[PDB]
Amino acid sequence: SVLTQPPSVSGAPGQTVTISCTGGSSNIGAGYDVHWYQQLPGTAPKLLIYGNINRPSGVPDRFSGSKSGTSASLAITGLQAEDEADYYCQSYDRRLSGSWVFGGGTKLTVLG
Amino acid sequence: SVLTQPPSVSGAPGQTVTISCTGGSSNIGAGYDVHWYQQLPGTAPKLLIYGNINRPSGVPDRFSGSKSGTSASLAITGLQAEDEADYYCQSYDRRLSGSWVFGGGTKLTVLG
Amino acid sequence: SVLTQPPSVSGAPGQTVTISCTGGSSNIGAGYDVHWYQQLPGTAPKLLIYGNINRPSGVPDRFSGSKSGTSASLAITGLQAEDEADYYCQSYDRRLSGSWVFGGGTKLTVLG
Amino acid sequence: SVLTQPPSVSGAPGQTVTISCTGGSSNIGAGYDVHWYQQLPGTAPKLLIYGNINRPSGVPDRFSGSKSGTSASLAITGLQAEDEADYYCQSYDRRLSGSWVFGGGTKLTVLG
Amino acid sequence: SVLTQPPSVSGAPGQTVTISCTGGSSNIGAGYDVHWYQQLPGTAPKLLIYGNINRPSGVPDRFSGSKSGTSASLAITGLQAEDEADYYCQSYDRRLSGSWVFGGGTKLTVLG
Amino acid sequence: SVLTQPPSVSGAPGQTVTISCTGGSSNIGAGYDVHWYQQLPGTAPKLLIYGNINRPSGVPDRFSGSKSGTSASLAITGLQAEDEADYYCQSYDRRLSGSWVFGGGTKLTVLG
Amino acid sequence: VQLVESGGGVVPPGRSLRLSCATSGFTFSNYGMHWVRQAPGKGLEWVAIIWYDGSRNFYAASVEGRFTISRDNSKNTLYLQMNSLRVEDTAVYYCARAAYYDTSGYGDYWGQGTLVTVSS
Amino acid sequence: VQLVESGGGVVPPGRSLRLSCATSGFTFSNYGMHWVRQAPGKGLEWVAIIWYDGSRNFYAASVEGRFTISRDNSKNTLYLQMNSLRVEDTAVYYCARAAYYDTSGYGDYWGQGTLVTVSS
Amino acid sequence: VQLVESGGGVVPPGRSLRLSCATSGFTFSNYGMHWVRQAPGKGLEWVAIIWYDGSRNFYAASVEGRFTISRDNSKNTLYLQMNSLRVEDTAVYYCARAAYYDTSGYGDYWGQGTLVTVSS
Amino acid sequence: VQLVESGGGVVPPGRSLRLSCATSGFTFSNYGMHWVRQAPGKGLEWVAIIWYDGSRNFYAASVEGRFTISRDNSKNTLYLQMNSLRVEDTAVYYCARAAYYDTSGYGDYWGQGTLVTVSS
Amino acid sequence: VQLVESGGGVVPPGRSLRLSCATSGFTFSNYGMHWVRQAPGKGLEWVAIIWYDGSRNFYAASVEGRFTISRDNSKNTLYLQMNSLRVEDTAVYYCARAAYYDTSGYGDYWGQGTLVTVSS
Amino acid sequence: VQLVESGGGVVPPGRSLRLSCATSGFTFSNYGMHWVRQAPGKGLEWVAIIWYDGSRNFYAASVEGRFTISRDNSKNTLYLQMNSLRVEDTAVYYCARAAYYDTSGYGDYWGQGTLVTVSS
Amino acid sequence: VQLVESGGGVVPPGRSLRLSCATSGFTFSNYGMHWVRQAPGKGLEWVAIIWYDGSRNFYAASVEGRFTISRDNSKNTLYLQMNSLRVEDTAVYYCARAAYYDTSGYGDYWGQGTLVTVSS
Amino acid sequence: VQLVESGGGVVPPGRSLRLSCATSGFTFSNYGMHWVRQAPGKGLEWVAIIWYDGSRNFYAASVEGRFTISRDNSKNTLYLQMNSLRVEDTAVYYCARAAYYDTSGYGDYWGQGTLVTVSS
Amino acid sequence: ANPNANPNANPNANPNANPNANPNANPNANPNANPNANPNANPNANPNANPNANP
């Protein structure tokens, strides 16, 4: 774990919540593109956001994001009960031998 | 719809009309060569320009073009009635899996 | 013509005359080996220089050459009356479908 | 003997034992298919495994093979007392004027 | 020697001792990262500290350090008899052709 | 003479002497294996070293080879009076029409 | 350089369809080929490529796993086999001869295409 | 695009286990692959990568020397050979298809994974 | 190495003409061959090549589809079959033996040429 | 497939001995065959191969020039004539029917062999 | 991770000596390597480097032109060839694996070295 | 393996001479052969190779077209027919058995040759 | 460090002359190079620089457009092509190895030089 | 040093015109360039600058957003693209080579210029 | 500026590059290769073959 994410976020349906991802000069401020994945309780992670702002056609516009300095973020608007999930950020760390690095993941709880 | 082109341009016979093509660092400013095709209403596109400035022996010197930064362009001089056609630009986007990408395409209307 | 050669060079017997050959990133600066041929008025274009600097055992040492960047050259020292000939440079253009490309040939006139 | 095999392996009935066979780029990593033979103590080296993983209908389904790079393998699961035998791997050698080559041969002892 | 280290340092078990490494504008104050190695009396050196403050998982937290200006320092807390060793600093001097430069080493003696 | 060899090498018996061979990027540095042959003064040559380093069984374990870039080598340890011979290196020159190319050959004189 | 196309027509969705681009006037085996398509009111889309000896294939992402590209060099013919055609795949399909300039490729000769309609 | 893992199960530590991922729906031979894992209660960890032509391989520092990644393009299959499994290696392993965007890469498709348990 | 040209002559346009180059002094079957031409008053134009075993050939764009080259290794003879000759094809045609150094090819031996004239 | 083997026994060194592998259960003439041997206390050594029609004959270097292999197709029997036997050549000699998989071959049926002792 | 060294011993000055470092536990081809040396009673001297793919070599000024560094990726082996050894070259030589942090690099794994003595 | 050579002697320039290398101890028909020569006082020069089945014949550039290499598989004999002998062709000619290792070939056995003198 | 100038001599003005330096003792490909000259009776004039990879070149204003600097790393050779030599270009030319200290550079291993005379 | 402008002429207001400056006698890529203009009866007006590597561009306030400056190092050419020409843009345009002294810069070499008329 | 090669650079392989096949390369046959027979091959054709009548 080299990217920092809060362990948990929450909010009532209809609310806007954000999930942060913070790195250093080795992996975000570095100029490396940030990616996000969504994992539901009994499945494999799904690409949510790629290229910092882009997303596959299977993702509703509820999700969007940004990158600035060493900060990155996933914004969720129109929060639904169905958005309960773990969200993970991903990047490349120039100080390590592996192609991908991750944050620890954030669990989003929707306060129904 | 990878490369941006205006949907329509026009001018009277004898005039000069130009058609733009704009990309980004992934497909024009990238260093990838730009190509142009001319399509007449009842047939397949014909190569008009290749290698940004060169052209087939079957193309009169009415057509020429250029490239700079992420911009590319087709110039038509001495516009004739027979030049009414669709013009398309083509390049290669390093972010995509396909060999060729096209712009939206521009229709040139000759105001005869 | 693919490779650029002057149409004519000259010098008196005993003088040194050089024949240039200039290409581009497609055929000399491209790393392709340059070859030279000598055609006498009533025969075939006999190989003079190969591999940029080497030559057949049938060639007197009065001939030598070089290649640098996109430039190449044939030098004739101790010019003789018998050296009047058409000299050609040959290479390979990576943008073209043909195995060989030539310059237009240079006529060396010996000023007897 | 050109393929490296342990001289002996063992295990109690019910256990899983394996026989290794490691070669070089000339005979295992060569692209050749590795074969295994089971030399029951008082007979001929009956074909056990073929095509790296397959086996004759005369072989129990507790025997199977495997291959990765220069490393070939034979596994026996659910080992029986009756599996005591000399196990050999076999391949070809690209630097050999002959044909078949064998490994050292491994004796499998079943620890009643 | 490129980096300057004192030849000797000592202290009683339980004490804190520090080892300095002083460079200049070419190799520490130059923005280059400082590394430290530990050599036990009859073996190869071990990476102790890297990246000025980080350390391998094989190093107990007794060892830590930092860099400021042109002076780097290794702090050893809770000095034990087993910490008696030769310590070396390492960096890169931009004026020299070699990848690494070393100080002369410091010998740490524990006053048992 | 394709491969470069010194005309002579010598030493007293009991000493170690080496025979070098240097080619180019077309014959040794080209990835072609180098072979060595020994020609005793009044007979046909015999294979001494193959595959750059190996010896053909009967050859005494006094002879061994080596390869590096365009360089190749034969080391003779335990030099005997009986080692007087012409030593030759053999390789394949990708620019030539033949199958084998030889160096000039080096005469080994044993000073005893 | 002739590029002659045939095989369009109309099918219910879910059905397969095979297109064929016959060529002549050049050495077929020395060149790679491309397929592109144009929906009836749209611009151009790239569909697939096959390397001169059949050793390498690429597909537009939108059709990968649904369309197959292949060649029979002895017949100077390029084929495109589409399975599970969708309504959305209606277009005029065209073959073209691969060409390459420096940093990117292009088509030089184009066929006239054939129309594939998927409907119900 | 379907990626399907198998070969999971439970072993004593010190034993080997071999995993595989079968794929369908895309040209396997044109893409690189990744393995990632998730221990129960933990986040995601990158394990290994293999290029499309097998020309490289990289491993997480914690597994290099124990794990081998390989592939067989003719079978559309990705393999992971794990030797000397440790208790610490218990996790669900997943295959994923390599993708690349600009300055960094990403995975796009995931399989379902399989659980490898190391215990005694 | 002796290369001998034969078969030039005046051809009404649209008609065919067949050229050949007889060879001796070397193993014809071990080498590829080239044809070049020189129109009177002009420089040299590469025309075509046949690989030593006939497996591949290439033609200049200016003649592809009209010219065919072949070789009969048992007769040590190189052939050029020109169909639909145009006036523009008037030139002295020469055979040459293929050679190659590192990055580009070259000819070493040449025949003496024969003249093909195409005219009303 | 069945193999019957005989011809072993003690032969003085330097003398020859012939081995015979009679076959049944298959058409002898449709398959090639192999000989291997195993000296007591040793692993397996490949000795010779013969091509189904006798056209290709290869030998281990240790016996090339010493042994002759032949297929008497008319007798459905494989023979090996061993000349100049050394005491080092004591071994059980075995026949097998040639089989072939893909990049390499194998035997797929073994006989029981016979013991050749070279001594006295 | 293992780095195993061999090749020390003693030579008279003027003679050459070759050292090598065999490695395992990691992918040799993905990492660059270093050599350092330690004369008895002295600190450490950097001697040489060689990027992973062999594309770049750098030497300490004190040895450039006298020492050569090279590697064979297929054997996981690093070599150092020293010519014209001087008395001053007596030292324990060590191989190490290249690692890099940010603005400078470091070695992480080290072998145990071997002693090279140069003396009358 | 033994190679026996004869056929040397003094021949006037312009005239021909045939060399013959008789072989035994191995299957001649399974191996290619080489001829090399050494003029007295000179180093070694490769002359020619013949492919085990006669499908390829390669010659040194200096002799191609004058020399013919052949092999009679039924007589275990290698021949070299030299026509138009020149004084410069005086040399001891040797046959050798072809062998091949990896990226290059080699000879692994030589006969003693015979001296061909071209004079008077 | 061995730096050797070659190719000097005397020419009439207007002629070209190429100078070059051969070198050894260090890795040529890792260093940039300089040329300087000294006219008889005069001090030193800097003439040109070339970067280690050939990417950049700078010239003294007095020679730009008349002189060209280049190098060939594979031959350990530095070249200077002098065109349209003027009388004023008479000087001894030297090759030097680039070195750099902090805010400025310097050379540290020069050759002996060679004399170029330009005169009618 | 020779700087040569091209592309003037007469253009109706609103239309574009493209100017260029070809250069020789110096290394184009090592220098920045300037464009200035002189209305036919006025003094000099600075128009634009381009940084030798193309990284920076600055424009006179009178033309910013209307004019674009660019370079092509492979053609030794400087370009100026003028869009939406206004009547007030009539002038002779000149290229010049950037030079710099201490606290300010200057042009040293100048071209001849070309006339652009914007009218009717 | 220092014109010399730069030591002090990361010498390790870079695990951050597109690992996928590249669909942007000349797909045409390459008319630039040695067209000759290539006298550099194993002339002893026996290391591996299928010996059966119907192989």
Automatic annotation (TrEMBL), chains G, H, I, J, K, L, M, N:
Q: Which residues of the full protein are shown?
A: 130 to 140 of 470
- Binding partners and assembly: Immunoglobulins are composed of two identical heavy chains and two identical light chains; disulfide-linked.
Whichever gene encodes this chain, its name is HEL-214
Q: Which organism is it from?
A: Homo sapiens (Human)
This chain's protein is named Epididymis luminal protein 214
Which compartments does it reside in? Cell membrane; Secreted
Where on the tree of life does the source sit, at the highest rank? Eukaryota
